[PDB]
Amino acid sequence: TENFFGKTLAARPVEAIPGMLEFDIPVHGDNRGWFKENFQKEKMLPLGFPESFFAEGKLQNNVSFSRKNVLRGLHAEPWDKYISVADGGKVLGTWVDLREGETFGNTYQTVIDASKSIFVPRGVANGFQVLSDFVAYSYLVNDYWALELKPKYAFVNYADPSLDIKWENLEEAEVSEADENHPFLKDVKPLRKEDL
Amino acid sequence: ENFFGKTLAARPVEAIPGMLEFDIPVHGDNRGWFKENFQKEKMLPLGFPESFFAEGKLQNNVSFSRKNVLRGLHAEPWDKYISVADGGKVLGTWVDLREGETFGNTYQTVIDASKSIFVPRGVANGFQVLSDFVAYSYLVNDYWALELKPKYAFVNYADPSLDIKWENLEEAEVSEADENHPFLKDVKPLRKEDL
Numbered sequence A: 001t002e003n004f005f006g007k008t009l010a011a012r013p014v015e016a017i018p019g020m021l022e023f024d025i026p027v028h029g030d031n032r033g034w035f036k037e038n039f040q041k042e043k044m045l046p047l048g049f050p051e052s053f054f055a056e057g058k059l060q061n062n063v064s065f066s067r068k069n070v071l072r073g074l075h076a077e078p079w080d081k082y083i084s085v086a087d088g089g090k091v092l093g094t095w096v097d098l099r100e101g102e103t104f105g106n107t108y109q110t111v112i113d114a115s116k117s118i119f120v121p122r123g124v125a126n127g128f129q130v131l132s133d134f135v136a137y138s139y140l141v142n143d144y145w146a147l148e149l150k151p152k153y154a155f156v157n158y159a160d161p162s163l164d165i166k167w168e169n170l171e172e173a174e175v176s177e178a179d180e181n182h183p184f185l186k187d188v189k190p191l192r193k194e195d196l
Numbered sequence B: 001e002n003f004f005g006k007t008l009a010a011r012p013v014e015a016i017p018g019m020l021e022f023d024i025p026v027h028g029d030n031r032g033w034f035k036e037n038f039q040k041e042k043m044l045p046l047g048f049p050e051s052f053f054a055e056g057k058l059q060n061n062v063s064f065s066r067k068n069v070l071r072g073l074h075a076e077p078w079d080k081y082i083s084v085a086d087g088g089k090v091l092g093t094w095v096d097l098r099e100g101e102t103f104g105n106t107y108q109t110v111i112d113a114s115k116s117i118f119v120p121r122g123v124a125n126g127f128q129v130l131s132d133f134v135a136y137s138y139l140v141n142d143y144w145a146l147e148l149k150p151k152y153a154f155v156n157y158a159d160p161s162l163d164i165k166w167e168n169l170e171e172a173e174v175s176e177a178d179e180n181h182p183f184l185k186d187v188k189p190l191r192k193e194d195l
Protein backbone atom coordinates (compact mmCIF):
# COMPACT_ATOMS: atom_id res chain seq x y z
CA THR A 1 0.00 0.00 0.00
CA GLU A 2 0.64 3.75 -0.35
CA ASN A 3 3.12 4.80 -3.04
CA PHE A 4 2.61 2.23 -5.81
CA PHE A 5 2.10 -1.40 -4.70
CA GLY A 6 -0.74 -2.96 -2.74
CA LYS A 7 -3.26 -0.11 -2.58
CA THR A 8 -6.86 -0.88 -1.57
CA LEU A 9 -9.29 -0.48 -4.49
CA ALA A 10 -11.00 2.89 -3.87
CA ALA A 11 -12.67 5.87 -5.61
CA ARG A 12 -12.83 9.64 -4.93
CA PRO A 13 -15.01 12.17 -6.73
CA VAL A 14 -13.38 15.33 -8.12
CA GLU A 15 -15.34 18.22 -6.62
CA ALA A 16 -14.63 20.82 -9.36
CA ILE A 17 -15.77 18.50 -12.19
CA PRO A 18 -19.09 16.65 -11.56
CA GLY A 19 -19.07 13.03 -12.82
CA MET A 20 -15.27 12.64 -12.70
CA LEU A 21 -13.76 9.94 -10.46
CA GLU A 22 -10.18 9.09 -9.44
CA PHE A 23 -9.37 5.43 -8.54
CA ASP A 24 -6.56 3.78 -6.55
CA ILE A 25 -5.79 0.49 -8.35
CA PRO A 26 -4.19 -2.53 -6.54
CA VAL A 27 -0.81 -3.41 -8.17
CA HIS A 28 0.77 -6.69 -7.02
CA GLY A 29 4.57 -6.93 -7.32
CA ASP A 30 6.99 -9.86 -7.36
CA ASN A 31 10.32 -10.94 -8.88
CA ARG A 32 8.93 -10.90 -12.45
CA GLY A 33 7.45 -7.38 -12.36
CA TRP A 34 3.79 -6.74 -11.51
CA PHE A 35 0.10 -7.52 -12.22
CA LYS A 36 -3.08 -5.38 -11.99
CA GLU A 37 -6.80 -5.67 -12.71
CA ASN A 38 -6.84 -2.32 -14.56
CA PHE A 39 -10.65 -2.44 -14.93
CA GLN A 40 -13.07 -4.92 -13.27
CA LYS A 41 -16.77 -4.20 -13.88
CA GLU A 42 -18.25 -6.15 -10.93
CA LYS A 43 -15.86 -4.61 -8.36
CA MET A 44 -16.03 -1.04 -9.75
CA LEU A 45 -19.80 -0.36 -10.13
CA PRO A 46 -20.26 -0.37 -6.27
CA LEU A 47 -17.48 2.29 -6.08
CA GLY A 48 -19.19 4.70 -8.51
CA PHE A 49 -17.99 3.74 -12.00
CA PRO A 50 -21.19 4.71 -13.84
CA GLU A 51 -23.55 2.04 -15.22
CA SER A 52 -24.40 4.62 -17.93
CA PHE A 53 -20.98 3.90 -19.56
CA PHE A 54 -22.63 0.70 -20.92
CA ALA A 55 -25.79 2.31 -22.37
CA GLU A 56 -25.15 1.64 -26.11
CA GLY A 57 -23.14 -1.60 -25.80
CA LYS A 58 -20.16 0.02 -27.54
CA LEU A 59 -16.48 -0.67 -26.70
CA GLN A 60 -13.06 0.46 -27.97
CA ASN A 61 -9.61 0.19 -26.33
CA ASN A 62 -6.90 2.65 -27.47
CA VAL A 63 -3.18 2.68 -26.59
CA SER A 64 -0.65 5.47 -27.22
CA PHE A 65 3.09 5.31 -26.61
CA SER A 66 4.90 8.63 -26.00
CA ARG A 67 8.33 10.06 -25.08
CA LYS A 68 9.30 12.54 -22.32
CA ASN A 69 7.77 16.06 -22.68
CA VAL A 70 5.15 14.96 -25.26
CA LEU A 71 1.86 16.79 -24.52
CA ARG A 72 -1.47 15.54 -25.99
CA GLY A 73 -4.71 17.57 -25.56
CA LEU A 74 -7.06 19.09 -24.80
CA HIS A 75 -9.75 16.92 -26.45
CA ALA A 76 -13.47 16.59 -25.62
CA GLU A 77 -14.84 14.03 -28.12
CA PRO A 78 -18.50 12.95 -27.64
CA TRP A 79 -17.84 9.82 -25.53
CA ASP A 80 -16.78 8.74 -22.00
CA LYS A 81 -13.16 7.69 -21.24
CA TYR A 82 -11.56 5.45 -18.60
CA ILE A 83 -7.81 6.23 -18.59
CA SER A 84 -4.65 4.72 -16.97
CA VAL A 85 -0.98 3.87 -17.57
CA ALA A 86 0.01 0.34 -18.77
CA ASP A 87 3.81 0.35 -18.19
CA GLY A 88 6.26 1.83 -15.60
CA GLY A 89 5.84 5.45 -16.84
CA LYS A 90 4.15 8.56 -15.44
CA VAL A 91 2.12 11.53 -16.79
CA LEU A 92 0.66 14.82 -15.58
CA GLY A 93 -3.07 14.49 -16.35
CA THR A 94 -5.07 17.67 -16.99
CA TRP A 95 -8.83 18.31 -17.45
CA VAL A 96 -11.05 21.28 -18.44
CA ASP A 97 -14.87 21.08 -18.17
CA LEU A 98 -16.53 22.18 -21.45
CA ARG A 99 -20.19 21.55 -20.43
CA GLU A 100 -22.75 24.40 -20.43
CA GLY A 101 -23.55 25.59 -16.91
CA GLU A 102 -22.06 26.47 -13.54
CA THR A 103 -18.89 24.40 -14.08
CA PHE A 104 -17.84 25.61 -17.57
CA GLY A 105 -14.07 26.20 -17.51
CA ASN A 106 -13.46 24.32 -14.21
CA THR A 107 -10.15 22.39 -14.03
CA TYR A 108 -8.30 19.53 -12.28
CA GLN A 109 -4.74 18.13 -12.53
CA THR A 110 -3.01 15.09 -10.98
CA VAL A 111 -0.06 12.71 -11.56
CA ILE A 112 -1.05 9.33 -13.08
CA ASP A 113 1.01 6.10 -12.96
CA ALA A 114 -0.09 2.42 -13.23
CA SER A 115 -1.55 2.55 -9.69
CA LYS A 116 -4.14 5.30 -10.53
CA SER A 117 -6.96 5.62 -13.06
CA ILE A 118 -9.48 8.31 -14.03
CA PHE A 119 -13.08 8.28 -15.31
CA VAL A 120 -13.68 11.31 -17.61
CA PRO A 121 -17.32 12.12 -18.46
CA ARG A 122 -18.33 13.09 -21.98
CA GLY A 123 -17.98 16.91 -22.28
CA VAL A 124 -14.81 17.21 -20.17
CA ALA A 125 -11.61 17.83 -22.16
CA ASN A 126 -8.74 15.33 -21.58
CA GLY A 127 -4.96 15.84 -21.86
CA PHE A 128 -1.56 14.82 -20.47
CA GLN A 129 2.17 15.60 -20.46
CA VAL A 130 4.77 12.80 -20.19
CA LEU A 131 7.00 12.97 -17.06
CA SER A 132 8.99 9.72 -17.54
CA ASP A 133 11.38 8.77 -20.36
CA PHE A 134 8.48 6.93 -22.09
CA VAL A 135 4.89 5.97 -21.23
CA ALA A 136 2.14 3.61 -22.44
CA TYR A 137 -1.29 5.20 -21.98
CA SER A 138 -4.29 2.89 -22.32
CA TYR A 139 -7.95 3.78 -22.28
CA LEU A 140 -11.46 2.35 -22.68
CA VAL A 141 -14.13 4.39 -24.54
CA ASN A 142 -17.84 3.92 -25.47
CA ASP A 143 -18.30 5.36 -28.98
CA TYR A 144 -16.37 5.17 -32.28
CA TRP A 145 -14.00 7.82 -33.73
CA ALA A 146 -14.08 8.67 -37.43
CA LEU A 147 -11.68 11.00 -39.27
CA GLU A 148 -14.49 12.78 -41.18
CA LEU A 149 -16.29 13.65 -37.94
CA LYS A 150 -13.30 15.45 -36.34
CA PRO A 151 -14.71 18.92 -37.30
CA LYS A 152 -17.74 18.02 -35.15
CA TYR A 153 -15.62 17.30 -32.04
CA ALA A 154 -14.81 19.82 -29.25
CA PHE A 155 -11.17 20.82 -28.59
CA VAL A 156 -9.37 23.54 -26.60
CA ASN A 157 -5.79 24.81 -27.01
CA TYR A 158 -3.28 23.44 -24.45
CA ALA A 159 -1.46 26.81 -24.35
CA ASP A 160 -4.42 29.17 -23.74
CA PRO A 161 -3.03 31.23 -20.83
CA SER A 162 -6.55 31.97 -19.50
CA LEU A 163 -7.00 28.29 -18.50
CA ASP A 164 -6.54 27.56 -14.78
CA ILE A 165 -3.84 24.94 -15.36
CA LYS A 166 -0.06 24.65 -15.19
CA TRP A 167 1.88 22.20 -17.34
CA GLU A 168 5.12 20.52 -16.17
CA ASN A 169 7.27 21.99 -18.93
CA LEU A 170 5.28 24.20 -21.31
CA GLU A 171 8.42 25.54 -22.96
CA GLU A 172 9.66 22.10 -24.04
CA ALA A 173 6.28 20.55 -24.93
CA GLU A 174 6.29 18.24 -27.97
CA VAL A 175 2.90 18.51 -29.68
CA SER A 176 1.02 17.55 -32.88
CA GLU A 177 0.25 20.03 -35.68
CA ALA A 178 -3.44 19.58 -34.73
CA ASP A 179 -2.86 20.42 -31.06
CA GLU A 180 -1.01 23.58 -32.06
CA ASN A 181 -4.09 24.86 -33.93
CA HIS A 182 -7.09 24.11 -31.63
CA PRO A 183 -9.16 27.22 -30.63
CA PHE A 184 -8.82 29.15 -27.35
CA LEU A 185 -11.64 28.70 -24.81
CA LYS A 186 -13.23 32.03 -25.79
CA ASP A 187 -14.05 30.48 -29.20
CA VAL A 188 -15.50 27.22 -27.79
CA LYS A 189 -19.29 27.01 -27.46
CA PRO A 190 -20.29 25.30 -24.15
CA LEU A 191 -21.73 21.79 -24.71
CA ARG A 192 -25.50 21.45 -24.08
CA LYS A 193 -26.91 18.39 -22.25
CA GLU A 194 -25.34 15.92 -24.73
CA ASP A 195 -26.23 18.31 -27.61
CA LEU A 196 -29.98 17.96 -26.77
CA GLU B 1 9.37 -2.85 -42.52
CA ASN B 2 6.61 -4.67 -40.61
CA PHE B 3 5.44 -2.79 -37.50
CA PHE B 4 3.68 0.39 -38.71
CA GLY B 5 0.78 0.74 -41.14
CA LYS B 6 -0.62 -2.83 -41.34
CA THR B 7 -4.13 -3.42 -42.74
CA LEU B 8 -6.62 -4.60 -40.07
CA ALA B 9 -7.08 -8.33 -40.74
CA ALA B 10 -7.83 -11.70 -39.08
CA ARG B 11 -6.53 -15.25 -39.73
CA PRO B 12 -7.55 -18.59 -38.14
CA VAL B 13 -5.13 -21.02 -36.47
CA GLU B 14 -5.69 -24.36 -38.23
CA ALA B 15 -4.48 -26.47 -35.29
CA ILE B 16 -6.68 -24.77 -32.65
CA PRO B 17 -10.33 -24.18 -33.66
CA GLY B 18 -11.73 -20.83 -32.49
CA MET B 19 -8.37 -19.03 -32.15
CA LEU B 20 -7.86 -15.88 -34.24
CA GLU B 21 -4.71 -13.88 -35.02
CA PHE B 22 -5.11 -10.16 -35.90
CA ASP B 23 -2.83 -7.63 -37.64
CA ILE B 24 -3.37 -4.24 -35.92
CA PRO B 25 -2.74 -0.82 -37.58
CA VAL B 26 -0.16 1.19 -35.62
CA HIS B 27 0.27 4.84 -36.62
CA GLY B 28 3.65 6.48 -35.89
CA ASP B 29 4.68 10.18 -35.68
CA ASN B 30 7.01 12.65 -33.87
CA ARG B 31 5.47 11.88 -30.47
CA GLY B 32 5.52 8.05 -30.57
CA TRP B 33 2.56 5.99 -31.81
CA PHE B 34 -1.19 5.27 -31.50
CA LYS B 35 -3.35 2.14 -32.06
CA GLU B 36 -7.00 1.06 -31.75
CA ASN B 37 -6.09 -2.10 -29.80
CA PHE B 38 -9.70 -3.37 -29.83
CA GLN B 39 -12.63 -1.86 -31.77
CA LYS B 40 -15.94 -3.75 -31.52
CA GLU B 41 -17.67 -2.42 -34.65
CA LYS B 42 -14.62 -3.12 -36.87
CA MET B 43 -13.70 -6.52 -35.37
CA LEU B 44 -17.08 -8.32 -35.29
CA PRO B 45 -17.22 -8.47 -39.16
CA LEU B 46 -13.74 -10.10 -39.15
CA GLY B 47 -14.72 -13.02 -36.88
CA PHE B 48 -14.35 -11.72 -33.29
CA PRO B 49 -17.20 -13.71 -31.66
CA GLU B 50 -20.34 -11.80 -30.57
CA SER B 51 -20.70 -14.47 -27.86
CA PHE B 52 -17.78 -12.78 -26.02
CA PHE B 53 -20.32 -10.15 -24.87
CA ALA B 54 -23.18 -12.58 -23.99
CA GLU B 55 -23.21 -11.94 -20.21
CA GLY B 56 -22.09 -8.29 -20.19
CA LYS B 57 -18.98 -9.24 -18.16
CA LEU B 58 -15.77 -7.21 -18.67
CA GLN B 59 -12.28 -7.12 -17.06
CA ASN B 60 -8.98 -5.62 -18.37
CA ASN B 61 -5.72 -6.95 -16.88
CA VAL B 62 -2.14 -5.67 -17.40
CA SER B 63 1.12 -7.42 -16.43
CA PHE B 64 4.57 -5.81 -16.64
CA SER B 65 7.52 -8.22 -17.01
CA ARG B 66 11.31 -8.18 -17.53
CA LYS B 67 13.52 -10.05 -20.07
CA ASN B 68 13.26 -13.90 -19.91
CA VAL B 69 10.21 -13.92 -17.62
CA LEU B 70 7.92 -16.83 -18.57
CA ARG B 71 4.22 -16.87 -17.50
CA GLY B 72 1.90 -19.88 -18.15
CA LEU B 73 0.39 -22.15 -19.19
CA HIS B 74 -3.09 -21.09 -17.98
CA ALA B 75 -6.55 -22.22 -19.21
CA GLU B 76 -9.09 -20.50 -16.94
CA PRO B 77 -12.83 -20.79 -17.79
CA TRP B 78 -13.20 -17.56 -19.85
CA ASP B 79 -12.19 -16.12 -23.23
CA LYS B 80 -9.15 -13.81 -23.69
CA TYR B 81 -8.15 -11.08 -26.16
CA ILE B 82 -4.43 -10.44 -25.76
CA SER B 83 -1.83 -7.90 -27.06
CA VAL B 84 1.25 -5.84 -26.13
CA ALA B 85 0.71 -2.24 -24.88
CA ASP B 86 4.28 -0.84 -25.06
CA GLY B 87 7.37 -1.23 -27.32
CA GLY B 88 8.18 -4.75 -26.05
CA LYS B 89 7.94 -8.24 -27.57
CA VAL B 90 7.02 -11.79 -26.43
CA LEU B 91 6.95 -15.36 -27.74
CA GLY B 92 3.26 -16.38 -27.39
CA THR B 93 2.47 -20.07 -26.79
CA TRP B 94 -0.84 -22.03 -26.85
CA VAL B 95 -1.83 -25.62 -25.93
CA ASP B 96 -5.40 -26.88 -26.63
CA LEU B 97 -6.73 -28.67 -23.49
CA ARG B 98 -10.27 -29.30 -24.81
CA GLU B 99 -11.74 -32.81 -25.03
CA GLY B 100 -11.80 -34.02 -28.65
CA GLU B 101 -9.69 -34.35 -31.79
CA THR B 102 -7.46 -31.35 -31.03
CA PHE B 103 -6.39 -32.14 -27.42
CA GLY B 104 -2.67 -31.38 -27.11
CA ASN B 105 -2.48 -29.34 -30.34
CA THR B 106 -0.12 -26.32 -30.19
CA TYR B 107 0.76 -22.96 -31.79
CA GLN B 108 3.50 -20.37 -31.15
CA THR B 109 4.16 -16.92 -32.65
CA VAL B 110 5.94 -13.62 -31.83
CA ILE B 111 3.65 -10.81 -30.53
CA ASP B 112 4.43 -7.07 -30.46
CA ALA B 113 2.00 -4.04 -30.39
CA SER B 114 1.06 -4.71 -34.07
CA LYS B 115 -0.44 -8.21 -33.38
CA SER B 116 -3.25 -9.50 -31.14
CA ILE B 117 -4.76 -12.93 -30.42
CA PHE B 118 -8.23 -14.23 -29.49
CA VAL B 119 -7.96 -17.33 -27.21
CA PRO B 120 -11.18 -19.37 -26.64
CA ARG B 121 -11.85 -20.83 -23.18
CA GLY B 122 -10.10 -24.21 -22.74
CA VAL B 123 -6.95 -23.26 -24.67
CA ALA B 124 -3.98 -22.67 -22.34
CA ASN B 125 -2.15 -19.31 -22.72
CA GLY B 126 1.51 -18.42 -22.00
CA PHE B 127 4.44 -16.20 -23.03
CA GLN B 128 8.18 -15.57 -22.64
CA VAL B 129 9.57 -11.99 -22.69
CA LEU B 130 12.04 -11.25 -25.55
CA SER B 131 12.64 -7.52 -24.92
CA ASP B 132 14.07 -5.72 -21.84
CA PHE B 133 10.51 -5.14 -20.54
CA VAL B 134 6.96 -5.68 -21.85
CA ALA B 135 3.45 -4.49 -20.95
CA TYR B 136 0.98 -7.29 -21.72
CA SER B 137 -2.68 -6.24 -21.76
CA TYR B 138 -5.77 -8.41 -22.10
CA LEU B 139 -9.58 -8.21 -22.11
CA VAL B 140 -11.57 -11.11 -20.55
CA ASN B 141 -15.27 -12.00 -20.06
CA ASP B 142 -15.55 -13.55 -16.57
CA TYR B 143 -14.16 -12.73 -13.13
CA TRP B 144 -11.13 -14.32 -11.43
CA ALA B 145 -11.49 -15.38 -7.78
CA LEU B 146 -8.69 -16.55 -5.48
CA GLU B 147 -11.08 -19.06 -3.83
CA LEU B 148 -11.81 -20.74 -7.17
CA LYS B 149 -8.22 -21.00 -8.46
CA PRO B 150 -7.83 -24.69 -7.41
CA LYS B 151 -10.57 -25.52 -9.97
CA TYR B 152 -8.96 -23.71 -12.96
CA ALA B 153 -7.01 -25.69 -15.60
CA PHE B 154 -3.20 -25.30 -15.84
CA VAL B 155 -0.32 -27.23 -17.51
CA ASN B 156 3.43 -27.08 -16.69
CA TYR B 157 5.56 -24.80 -18.93
CA ALA B 158 8.58 -27.14 -18.71
CA ASP B 159 6.87 -30.46 -19.60
CA PRO B 160 9.01 -31.75 -22.49
CA SER B 161 6.01 -33.77 -23.77
CA LEU B 162 4.42 -30.50 -25.01
CA ASP B 163 4.99 -29.84 -28.73
CA ILE B 164 6.50 -26.39 -28.07
CA LYS B 165 9.94 -24.76 -27.87
CA TRP B 166 10.60 -21.75 -25.61
CA GLU B 167 13.11 -19.00 -26.51
CA ASN B 168 15.36 -19.58 -23.46
CA LEU B 169 14.22 -22.37 -21.15
CA GLU B 170 17.44 -22.63 -19.11
CA GLU B 171 17.30 -18.97 -18.10
CA ALA B 172 13.49 -18.64 -17.75
CA GLU B 173 12.24 -16.72 -14.67
CA VAL B 174 8.91 -18.12 -13.37
CA SER B 175 6.60 -17.91 -10.32
CA GLU B 176 6.56 -20.70 -7.70
CA ALA B 177 2.93 -21.37 -8.73
CA ASP B 178 4.04 -21.93 -12.34
CA GLU B 179 6.82 -24.28 -11.17
CA ASN B 180 4.19 -26.53 -9.65
CA HIS B 181 1.43 -26.92 -12.29
CA PRO B 182 0.65 -30.51 -13.45
CA PHE B 183 2.23 -32.21 -16.50
CA LEU B 184 0.06 -32.91 -19.60
CA LYS B 185 -0.34 -36.60 -18.69
CA ASP B 186 -2.11 -35.57 -15.47
CA VAL B 187 -4.53 -33.09 -17.08
CA LYS B 188 -7.97 -34.54 -17.90
CA PRO B 189 -9.30 -33.06 -21.18
CA LEU B 190 -11.79 -30.24 -20.51
CA ARG B 191 -15.48 -30.82 -21.30
CA LYS B 192 -17.99 -28.07 -22.13
CA GLU B 193 -19.38 -28.65 -18.62
CA ASP B 194 -15.96 -27.65 -17.18
CA LEU B 195 -15.83 -24.29 -19.01
Ligand SMILES: Cc1cn([C@H]2C[C@H](O)[C@@H](COP(=O)(O)OP(=O)(O)O[C@H]3O[C@@H](C)[C@H](O)[C@@H](O)[C@H]3O)O2)c(=O)[nH]c1=O
Pocket (backbone or CB within 6 Å): A062, A064, A072, A073, A074, A075, A077, A081, A126, A127, A128, A145, A176, A178, B027, B034, B035, B036
Ligand atom coordinates in the same frame (compact mmCIF):
# COMPACT_ATOMS: atom_id res chain seq x y z
C1 LIG C 1 -8.25 9.05 -31.64
C2 LIG C 1 -7.93 8.08 -32.76
C3 LIG C 1 -6.84 8.31 -33.60
N1 LIG C 1 -6.58 7.43 -34.60
C4 LIG C 1 -5.39 7.63 -35.48
C5 LIG C 1 -5.36 8.91 -36.31
C6 LIG C 1 -3.88 9.27 -36.32
O1 LIG C 1 -3.24 8.67 -37.46
C7 LIG C 1 -3.30 8.67 -35.04
C8 LIG C 1 -3.07 9.71 -33.95
O2 LIG C 1 -4.25 10.50 -33.77
P1 LIG C 1 -4.27 11.83 -32.86
O3 LIG C 1 -5.77 12.39 -32.97
O4 LIG C 1 -3.02 12.75 -33.29
O5 LIG C 1 -4.01 11.14 -31.43
P2 LIG C 1 -3.96 11.86 -29.99
O6 LIG C 1 -3.26 10.80 -29.00
O7 LIG C 1 -3.46 13.37 -30.18
O8 LIG C 1 -5.54 11.90 -29.65
C9 LIG C 1 -6.05 11.51 -28.39
O9 LIG C 1 -5.69 12.50 -27.40
C10 LIG C 1 -6.16 12.22 -26.08
C11 LIG C 1 -5.65 13.30 -25.12
C12 LIG C 1 -7.69 12.12 -26.10
O10 LIG C 1 -8.19 11.74 -24.82
C13 LIG C 1 -8.16 11.10 -27.15
O11 LIG C 1 -9.59 11.04 -27.24
C14 LIG C 1 -7.57 11.42 -28.52
O12 LIG C 1 -8.08 12.66 -29.02
O13 LIG C 1 -4.24 7.67 -34.62
C15 LIG C 1 -7.37 6.34 -34.77
O14 LIG C 1 -7.13 5.46 -35.73
N2 LIG C 1 -8.42 6.10 -33.98
C16 LIG C 1 -8.71 6.95 -32.97
O15 LIG C 1 -9.75 6.69 -32.21
Ligand SMILES: Cc1cn([C@H]2C[C@H](O)[C@@H](COP(=O)(O)OP(=O)(O)O[C@H]3O[C@@H](C)[C@H](O)[C@@H](O)[C@H]3O)O2)c(=O)[nH]c1=O
Pocket (backbone or CB within 6 Å): A028, A035, A036, A037, B061, B063, B071, B072, B073, B074, B076, B125, B126, B127, B144, B175, B177
Ligand atom coordinates in the same frame (compact mmCIF):
# COMPACT_ATOMS: atom_id res chain seq x y z
C1 LIG D 1 -5.11 -13.55 -12.81
C2 LIG D 1 -5.28 -12.57 -11.68
C3 LIG D 1 -4.31 -12.46 -10.68
N1 LIG D 1 -4.48 -11.59 -9.66
C4 LIG D 1 -3.45 -11.42 -8.61
C5 LIG D 1 -3.08 -12.63 -7.75
C6 LIG D 1 -1.59 -12.43 -7.48
O1 LIG D 1 -1.36 -11.71 -6.25
C7 LIG D 1 -1.08 -11.58 -8.63
C8 LIG D 1 -0.29 -12.36 -9.68
O2 LIG D 1 -1.06 -13.48 -10.10
P1 LIG D 1 -0.45 -14.68 -10.97
O3 LIG D 1 -1.61 -15.79 -11.00
O4 LIG D 1 1.02 -15.07 -10.43
O5 LIG D 1 -0.32 -13.92 -12.39
P2 LIG D 1 0.10 -14.54 -13.84
O6 LIG D 1 0.48 -13.25 -14.72
O7 LIG D 1 1.13 -15.77 -13.66
O8 LIG D 1 -1.32 -15.11 -14.35
C9 LIG D 1 -1.78 -14.87 -15.68
O9 LIG D 1 -1.00 -15.66 -16.59
C10 LIG D 1 -1.42 -15.61 -17.96
C11 LIG D 1 -0.50 -16.47 -18.83
C12 LIG D 1 -2.88 -16.06 -18.06
O10 LIG D 1 -3.33 -15.93 -19.40
C13 LIG D 1 -3.77 -15.22 -17.14
O11 LIG D 1 -5.11 -15.70 -17.17
C14 LIG D 1 -3.25 -15.27 -15.71
O12 LIG D 1 -3.39 -16.61 -15.21
O13 LIG D 1 -2.24 -11.01 -9.25
C15 LIG D 1 -5.60 -10.81 -9.63
O14 LIG D 1 -5.78 -9.94 -8.65
N2 LIG D 1 -6.54 -10.92 -10.59
C16 LIG D 1 -6.40 -11.77 -11.60
O15 LIG D 1 -7.36 -11.83 -12.54
Ligand code: NI
Pocket (backbone or CB within 6 Å): A045, A048, A049, A050, A051
Ligand atom coordinates in the same frame (compact mmCIF):
# COMPACT_ATOMS: atom_id res chain seq x y z
NI1 NI E 1 -23.81 3.66 -10.23
